[PDB]
Amino acid sequence: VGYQPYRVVVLSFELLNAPATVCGPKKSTNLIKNKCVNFNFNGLTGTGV
Amino acid sequence: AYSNNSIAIPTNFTISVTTEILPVSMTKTSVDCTMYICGDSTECSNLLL
């Protein structure tokens, strides 16, 4: 070990505000409004109405 | 024109009206301790405690 090959993959991320192309496996719930809730829009979280 | 035996006595007069402006009070303000710093976030409020 030390003279054996290693396969290296490095991923570079780019958040931006353009439409998302790669996403996590999270499941999407239905949308509600007129109510103080916790939301998650394309990875952007927060709390509000 | 100073002299040791000379005086000046006014004969007429003028009635003048002047203006003076003085600030008395300023606007009263209030600040929310938590909603300015950690607005709508339970984690940040817990840290602020």
Ligand SMILES: *[C@@H]1O[C@H](CO)[C@@H](O)[C@H](O)[C@H]1NC(C)=O
């Ligand atoms: C001051 O008054 C005297 C008189 O008492 C006069 O002789 C003298 O000239 C006066 N002084 C001046 C500078 O005029």
Ligand SMILES: *[C@@H]1O[C@H](CO)[C@@H](O)[C@H](O)[C@H]1NC(C)=O
């Ligand atoms: C004082 O001034 C007023 C305004 O100019 C004038 O009408 C009046 O005659 C004057 N008085 C005297 C005593 O000069």
